[PDB]
Design a protein around this ligand. Structure first.
Ligand SMILES: *[C@@H]1O[C@H](CO)[C@@H](O)[C@H](O)[C@H]1NC(C)=O
Ligand SMILES: *[C@@H]1O[C@H](CO)[C@@H](O)[C@H](O)[C@H]1NC(C)=O
Ligand SMILES: *[C@@H]1O[C@H](CO)[C@@H](O)[C@H](O)[C@H]1NC(C)=O
Ligand SMILES: *[C@@H]1O[C@H](CO)[C@@H](O)[C@H](O)[C@H]1NC(C)=O
Lengths: 162, 162
């Protein structure tokens, strides 16, 4: 199985993601997204693209990406500080269940996987999440995929921020 | 007029703030909140306080505060990185109108004002906002209040983030 053959699941309407906020990453590929909270935001009233935004928040640092849909259930992200473009897909989504929300998303470079973001608001207890992680680690470079919350800084009174 | 005599307006339900996202600051007191976007977030499923969160995002830096209601329409903020507490009030709110949303919030130290955050998603065109700003600048230390968006970094394809 190669990265290009992973499922490209249908992307739920943006409000379902917004209604899932806040989410935390459970499994990621590089260290960049360890100990990270994800927030979805509707487009600004003054946005001329009317693209929503994904926020990756790690302590006091934040990466933001406006995004729009592309071919084959892709999400085309525009990293807001650089203008750098990224193409993402979802392995699966399972939003707004009785046990909350989870999803796993990935970024390929051809047959190899180069980034992975499994998110939840239920501390990784959706059986679909563990299962997707086990499939993703079988694609080339999937060996890098690992638990995102092993060594996170202590909190100071909040729950999704530190 | 002193800071303690400013209006303490009723705080709209949290969903009305969330539905206003993203907002930008129009008038602030210190430089800290210039060129800043505000995002409201519902409490995490795993939060034991069930406090929502306000996010102040300035480029790639973020301050987060969990908050709960206090006496006399106060908002009691817990800055998530330090545990430092702040007591805020709203001068007025005007959320989810035909011309979008605006509000002005302030933080006193007794009779003096020490921080001010007027937010909107309509580029400061709510007449209530200019009017509130003119009142706030008359309390002691209100002379510091000024336009928040005079020298902001260039964007790279997004609208509420840079
Ligand atoms: C994809 O692979 C090649 C290296 O083999 C590299 O030149 C290119 O920048 C890579 N792209 C990304 C987005 O990592
Ligand atoms: C979240 O899940 C991990 C196991 O993956 C567990 O060790 C940890 O204590 C759980 N956290 C909470 C808040 O229950
Ligand atoms: C309020 O005023 C005094 C200085 O006159 C200072 O000691 C105290 O820390 C101030 N509090 C805040 C929150 O600024
Ligand atoms: C926002 O308002 C200011 C005046 O306060 C104006 O100079 C600026 O061009 C406006 N921005 C947009 C995007 O219309």
């Amino acid at each position: 199985l190669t990265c290009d053959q992973l499922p490209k699941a249908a992307i739920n309407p943006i409000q379902e993601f917004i209604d899932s906020n806040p989410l935390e990453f459970e499994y990621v590929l590089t260290e960049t997204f360890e100990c990270t909270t994800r927030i979805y935001v509707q487009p600004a009233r003054w946005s001329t693209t009317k693209a929503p935004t994904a926020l990756d928040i790690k302590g006091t640092q934040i990466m933001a990406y406006d995004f729009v849909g592309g071919p084959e259930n892709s999400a085309h992200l525009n990293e807001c500080h650089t203008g750098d473009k990224q193409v993402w897909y979802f392995q699966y989504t399972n939003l707004l269940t009785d046990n909350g929300s989870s999803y796993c998303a990935y970024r390929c470079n051809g047959t190899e996987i180069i980034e992975y973001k499994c998110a939840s608001n239920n501390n990784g207890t959706d059986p679909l999440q563990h299962q997707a992680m086990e499939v993703a680690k079988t694609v080339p470079n999937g060996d890098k995929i690992h638990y995102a919350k092993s060594n996170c800084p202590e909190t100071h009174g909040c729950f999704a921020f530190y």
